[PDB]
Amino acid sequence: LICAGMAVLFLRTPTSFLPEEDQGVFMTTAQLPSGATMVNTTKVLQQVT
Amino acid sequence: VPSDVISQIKVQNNQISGGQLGGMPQAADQQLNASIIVQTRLQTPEEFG
Structure with missing residues (x-):
């Protein structure tokens, strides 16, 4: 039963890559x-500025 | 003479940088910018012939 429990925990983590964070400066294209x-x-670009 | 044949092959089987219309620097009121195609390298034997 504990095996089933932490196997449910095992299946709870999808294969993502990386989260995001704060840096301070960003870019607009x-x-x-x-x-x-x-x-x-x-x-x-002048309108954006 | 083979020399003139070689020279003519060099001339006619040549790629020429055609530039582009309205390239930098351009006028202040034109909206068209397109490349210019002048000559491309020959491909088929009948093209050489």
Whole structure:
């Protein structure tokens, strides 16, 4: 019965990889449609700023 | 003469960097940016012929 119990505990941990944390600084990316002129990218980045 | 044949093969079986329309630096009011294809390396024997 104890074997069944900690086998239930054994099956309780899925195969994840790693959790997240706090760092202090982050990054924002902007992607524009294919064939977009750099002027539009500059406008979008200025809007983000 | 074989020399001219070699020279012509070198010329016609050549890849040429065609640049692109509206590359950097560009005007302030254009929206089009596309690569330019000029010449590609030959593939088939009848292409060489």
